[PDB]
Amino acid sequence: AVDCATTKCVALTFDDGPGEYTNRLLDELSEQHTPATFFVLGKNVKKYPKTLKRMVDEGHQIGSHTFDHKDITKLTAEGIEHEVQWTDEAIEQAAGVKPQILRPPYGAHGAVYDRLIPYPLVLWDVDTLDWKHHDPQKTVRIALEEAKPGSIILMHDIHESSVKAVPQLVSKLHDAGYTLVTVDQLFAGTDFKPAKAYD
Numbered sequence: 001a002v003d004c005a006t007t008k009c010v011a012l013t014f015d016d017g018p019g020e021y022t023n024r025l026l027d028e029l030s031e032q033h034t035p036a037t038f039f040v041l042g043k044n045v046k047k048y049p050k051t052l053k054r055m056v057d058e059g060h061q062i063g064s065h066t067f068d069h070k071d072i073t074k075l076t077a078e079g080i081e082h083e084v085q086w087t088d089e090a091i092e093q094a095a096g097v098k099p100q101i102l103r104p105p106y107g108a109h110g111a112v113y114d115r116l117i118p119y120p121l122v123l124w125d126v127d128t129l130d131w132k133h134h135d136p137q138k139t140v141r142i143a144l145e146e147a148k149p150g151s152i153i154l155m156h157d158i159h160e161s162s163v164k165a166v167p168q169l170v171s172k173l174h175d176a177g178y179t180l181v182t183v184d185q186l187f188a189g190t191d192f193k194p195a196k197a198y199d
């Protein structure tokens with residue numbers, strides 16, 4: 001519904017879910033009427049079919065974070081294929097959709113490896129560092145002050161503070177004139193290709 005070339009857009013992304021906090025995170029997002037992108041771990045997906053179905057039905061985007069969060073630069077072609085495909089089949093069985101984007105674990109990637117990934121590689125330009133400090137106030141502060149039009153903000157769906165940060169983060173971005181979108185919406189009208197990395 002929105003042209004991110006026209007207006008200030010941001011994509012809120014969450015890695016390494018789903019887990020125990022995902023449904024409450026989904027509650028906050030719903031409450032704020034805010035779509036997000038979840039880069040899910042293949043291995044967690046199998047424990048959370050309902051929750052992934054919920055992501056799809058409530059307008060969020062699901063991307064791949066590989067199966068078990070391994071550094072793809074150290075894997076064989078076989079291992080990478082497994083990382084990609086097992087995660088796809090997991091997501092598909094659980095939610096009925098296949099991911100259209102992949103985020104490489106630890107941001108580690110390279111042309112020779114990316115060639116083997118059937119999706120666009122999606123990185124980030126804002127690292128909230130929530131994985132390290134687990135702190136909702138600092139998560140908000142970094143996201144808010146570092147965000148730019150077209151930014152992709154990296155957060156992790158692995159702890160409480162992401163649930164706690166969303167109301168304040170969404171409120172402050174909105175008030176600053178930003179619209180929150182999925183990665184898909186963010187890249188509509190821009191080139192976005194398989195085996196290519198974007199942040």
Ligand SMILES: CC(=O)N[C@@H]1[C@@H](O)[C@H](O[C@@H]2O[C@H](CO)[C@@H](O)[C@H](O)[C@H]2NC(C)=O)[C@@H](CO)O[C@H]1O
Nearest residue numbers: 015016069103104105106107127129131154156
């Ligand atoms: C040297 C380096 O790459 N440092 C940071 C990465 O460790 C970091 O990746 C995140 O590391 C966490 C601890 O192992 C993981 O829990 C987290 O899932 C992993 N991130 C992702 C996207 O897989 C990245 C991203 O935050 O930043 C680097 O600076």
